[PDB]
Amino acid sequence: SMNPPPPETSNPNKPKAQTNQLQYLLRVVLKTLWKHQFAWPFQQPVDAVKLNLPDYYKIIKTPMDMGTIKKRLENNYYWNAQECIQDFNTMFTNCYIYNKPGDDIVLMAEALEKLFLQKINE
Numbered sequence: 001s002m003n004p005p006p007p008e009t010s011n012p013n014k015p016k017a018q019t020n021q022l023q024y025l026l027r028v029v030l031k032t033l034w035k036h037q038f039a040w041p042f043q044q045p046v047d048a049v050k051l052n053l054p055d056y057y058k059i060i061k062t063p064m065d066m067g068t069i070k071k072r073l074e075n076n077y078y079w080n081a082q083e084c085i086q087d088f089n090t091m092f093t094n095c096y097i098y099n100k101p102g103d104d105i106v107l108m109a110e111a112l113e114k115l116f117l118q119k120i121n122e
């Protein structure tokens with residue numbers, strides 16, 4: 001019947017930071033993934049209503065997507081780069097937990113994860 005609210009992208013109790021690694025994650029790592037041909041499923045929250053996934057938000061306890069990560073980065077939401085990296089890992093992990101080995105969406109996530117890891121190697 002209804003999707004939960006997307007994850008928060010701003011929080012005035014949460015100190016704003018921008019570190020040099022966070023600056024790289026936005027301007028290089030997120031930008032590279034965002035423009036990839038496999039990005040489209042991950043550019044917004046999972047729409048469990050439209051995809052007809054009544055159990056998604058029961059199983060996936062920390063939903064995450066790159067639209068949220070982009071906004072977090074743009075809003076200086078993260079305290080350091082490790083917390084941003086954790087969000088990306090959560091995003092890939094959610095897709096692997098909900099879906100099945102060999103599903104196209106899974107194979108897309110694995111390719112983006114590999115790319116992500118290659119880019120965070122600078």
Ligand SMILES: CCOc1cc(N2CCC(O)CC2)ccc1Nc1ncc2c(n1)N(C)c1ccccc1C(=O)N2C
Pocket residue numbers: 040041042045046047051053094095098099105
């Ligand atoms: C922006 C446009 O988004 C979509 C368009 C279409 N279609 C449908 C069929 C029409 O004919 C044309 C368009 C289908 C899916 C998406 N979006 C989308 N968002 C998130 C997920 C995802 N798909 N996949 C594939 C998953 C499917 C099942 C369970 C989980 C997921 C999943 O883990 N993620 C990340």
